[PDB]
């Protein structure tokens, strides 16, 4: 038994993470075969980042501006070429640890693991859900900006996130590995701000089922109610207000049948509410009321 939020074994992905220094600026990079991907904006310094003019910044650079490092090994940068918001750096080495892999674009509600790393080295890993507002809430310090999000199945790593920024609300945005931002964000430090996010139903039901397999089970049952949360739905269908001596009064039949009044109320309450759906109670329909608590204890 047990249920924990659980990231995929980071291994397969660990070995494709490279450093990408370019000035005093260092991001991470996802290095697959002979290409390394990583945010553009690495071609920036503090003093840029404004509303910067990329490509007007890119190829002010060229191949020698990029310091790619797989830990030990420096990798050499044949060709550089922008791609939406990424950078496809071309390099003199196919990465021997490259995995069976594919680029996908995750849908809101879906989940991946994030392998969050700084200076091109795995710091930690944790699971993360794609909000329906397109931001996603992880732990990202500055200098984490290459680290990726993925899912695994059998052996095929599936990259669906690469991390660019942190909206001022404290959430994070990013891009698929085509470099197109998830949501309506531009990679550029402006007055932008996350959508108005909403809870992910099917994942809450999903979770509930999980609460049930580890037999947490309680909620499943009929709920109960309180007193003046009942009178609240009395006056509705036109019933006398129920009261505290009205309750200890039903004591006897509570005890006898073993069912609190307030849990009976609960069901009286739905009987009003959602009707009675072609079911008979004591061969009846309309809820009988000319029987007192005692007229019952006598007859039984």
């Amino acid at each position: 038994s047990g249920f924990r939020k659980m990231a995929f074994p980071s291994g397969k992905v660990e070995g494709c993470m490279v450093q990408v220094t370019c000035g005093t600026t260092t991001l991470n990079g996802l290095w697959l075969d002979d290409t390394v991907y990583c945010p553009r904006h690495v071609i920036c310094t503090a003093e840029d980042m404004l509303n910067p003019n990329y490509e007007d910044l890119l190829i002010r650079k060229s191949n020698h501006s990029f310091l790619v490092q797989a830990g030990n090994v420096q990798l050499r940068v044949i060709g550089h070429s922008m791609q939406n918001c990424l950078l496809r750096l071309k390099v003199d080495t196919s990465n021997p640890k490259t995995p069976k892999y594919k680029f996908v674009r995750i849908q809101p509600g879906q989940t991946f693991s994030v392998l969050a790393c700084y200076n091109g080295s795995p710091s930690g890993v944790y699971q993360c859900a794609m909000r329906p507002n397109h931001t996603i809430k992880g732990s990202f310090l500055n200098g984490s900006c290459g680290s990726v999000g993925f899912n695994i199945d059998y052996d095929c790593v599936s990259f669906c996130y690469m991390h660019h920024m942190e909206l001022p609300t404290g959430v994070h945005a990013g891009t698929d590995l085509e470099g197109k931002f998830y949501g309506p964000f531009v990679d550029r430090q402006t007055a932008q701000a996350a959508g108005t996010d909403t809870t992910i139903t099917l994942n809450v039901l999903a979770w509930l089922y999980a609460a049930v397999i580890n037999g947490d089970r309680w909620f499943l049952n009929r709920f109960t109610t309180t007193l003046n949360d009942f009178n609240l739905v009395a006056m509705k269908y036109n019933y006398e207000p129920l009261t505290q001596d009205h309750v200890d009064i039903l004591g006897p039949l509570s005890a006898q049948t073993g069912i609190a009044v307030l849990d009976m109320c609960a069901a009286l309450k739905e009987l009003l509410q959602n009707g009675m759906n072609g079911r008979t109670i004591l061969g009846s329909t309309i809820l009988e009321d000319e029987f007192t608590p005692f007229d019952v204890v006598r007859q039984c």
């Binding site: 945010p39 964000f185 007055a191 701000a193």
Partner: peptide, 5 residues
């Protein structure tokens, strides 16, 4: 408002 990152 936001930071790159």
């Amino acid at each position: 408002x936001a930071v790159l990152x």
